[PDB]
Amino acid sequence: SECSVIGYNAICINRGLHQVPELPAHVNYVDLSLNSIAELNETSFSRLQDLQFLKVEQQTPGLVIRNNTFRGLSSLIILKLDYNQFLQLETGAFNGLANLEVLTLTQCNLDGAVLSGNFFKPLTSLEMLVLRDNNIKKIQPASFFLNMRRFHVLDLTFNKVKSICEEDLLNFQGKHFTLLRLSSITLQDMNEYWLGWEKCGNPFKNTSITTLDLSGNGFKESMAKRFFDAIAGTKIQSLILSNSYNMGSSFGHTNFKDPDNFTFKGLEASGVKTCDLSKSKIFALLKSVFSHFTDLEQLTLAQNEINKIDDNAFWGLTHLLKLNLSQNFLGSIDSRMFENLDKLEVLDLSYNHIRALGDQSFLGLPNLKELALDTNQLKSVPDGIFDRLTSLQKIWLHTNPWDCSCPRIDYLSRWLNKNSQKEQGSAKCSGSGKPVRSIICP
């Protein structure tokens, strides 16, 4: 035999094959990736009726899949045809695949007709469709999607999609997606003066989404506001807007606006439980900016350019448990910054430039379990700063230039010694390099 056959698995990778090889009838897993198969047809898999898992990824460019190629593979659950450059599908290529659950077609130069034509009509049990990195410019699923009742995962990452509107996504109405990944599709036409805004309606009408990934799409504030107004009411549990590269003003520039209280108003009825706005050049957290996220439990703003947090920035976040502000440009913390966060359990302030903590910085945070202040520029803290943090389980204070002069260091050294089971890593004195916990002031 040409391939390596172990039990139920035929591994046929990179064997210089020009056709499907001869294999034991009992194999149910076949990997034919990295071969030179130019054409597949109904004879190709006619001796392998028991296949459950089939890969034919990244052949020489131009693979042709004829009608009924997989007809009679009525046990096939997973089919992967990724990285077939200039893949040529006949419209009945997937005939017979009523039980297929996963189809992957990443980077196959496919266009929007692959969703609007009859290619996927036979796939009545389909659960997951991966179409990343193709040439899909509009997302317009054909009417048969209405009856694909287990369909719940779609990934269109890296397609250059001009715009999405209610009329495009019609045939996804009524679905519950567990994952809708529309990352880095750009949506270039949907700008400030586009007439499509008046008629766009709600792209996600009567659709619910557990995880909506809209990362890497720009989302200039004015665009975000329009987009979230358009989808108002859509139930979304987890919203990913990381790498929204137009959203923030940026540190030292005012060409663009940071989000404000009106930006996310459309999300008020969405029930969002987690939100990721990391890596989006945000400079200022403005008054009530997050107050429409009435159900929010986790929020990351990591890796922005945040240097300014307005009073009442977190107003209305009465359910928030976790707040990540790691890797920003904060120069200090004061007690007003973190008002309106009574339920907070996890506060990450690591990798900032913080050089001072205001006297009662954490007074409004009695439920805090985890507090990261590592990798900042703290030389000292005010006496008693951590005393009311009665639920604290972990604290990071390392990689800070602690001034271990006495009596300045008295409180912190005594506190870190008394609470040595909470400290993660080891806070060290500038100069001497000894652990802060070991300093005894007389």
Partner: protein, 169 residues
């Protein structure tokens, strides 16, 4: 002894993957900077005649963004080797992934500096000398270039994933 050879080809394949991932990460940063530049350029083009004072603030930001592109181009490294400054781009990176000598994989990555991408000369205060459409086109060509380089690396990564599965079998 044949087992050692498979173990070696596999480790070298994983390392190719980590290298490619580092480059993909940096390229997605470049891409994001370029799209922000595009958006700033669009906003500049839509700036009224009475609002011409805004153009200098836009140029200031784009100039800093062009600097960031160059910072990425110059610092991005794996295993002590620069990935995106073009300095390795004629030889490329070669991985020994075959269970015998000859079976080999070479990856070329072009320079992604602002000069190599042709976005160095952008100037939103000077649509009178270098047309808005030409400046926008420069930015779109640079976006296409970065995106094509990323796609190319995705194909090679996929090849390396399959080679690892192959060696394991």
């Amino acid at each position: 002894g044949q087992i050692r050879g498979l173990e070696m080809a596999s480790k070298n394949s994983q390392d190719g993957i980590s290298l490619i991932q580092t480059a993909e990460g940096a390229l997605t940063e470049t891409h994001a900077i370029l799209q922000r530049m595009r958006e700033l350029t669009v906003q500049a083009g839509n700036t009224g005649t009475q609002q011409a004072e805004d153009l200098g603030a836009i140029k200031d930001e784009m100039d800093a963004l062009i600097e960031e592109i160059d910072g990425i181009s110059n610092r991005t490294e794996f295993n002590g080797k620069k990935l995106l400054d073009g300095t390795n781009s004629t030889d490329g990176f070669t991985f020994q992934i075959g269970a015998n000598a000859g079976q080999q994989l070479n990856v070329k990555i072009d320079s992604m500096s602002s000069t190599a991408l042709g976005v160095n000369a952008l100037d939103v205060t000077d649509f009178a000398a270098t047309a808005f459409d030409d400046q926008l086109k420069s930015i779109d060509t640079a976006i296409n270039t970065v995106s094509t380089q990323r796609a190319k690396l995705g194909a090679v990564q996929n090849r390396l994933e399959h080679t690892i599965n192959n060696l394991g079998a």
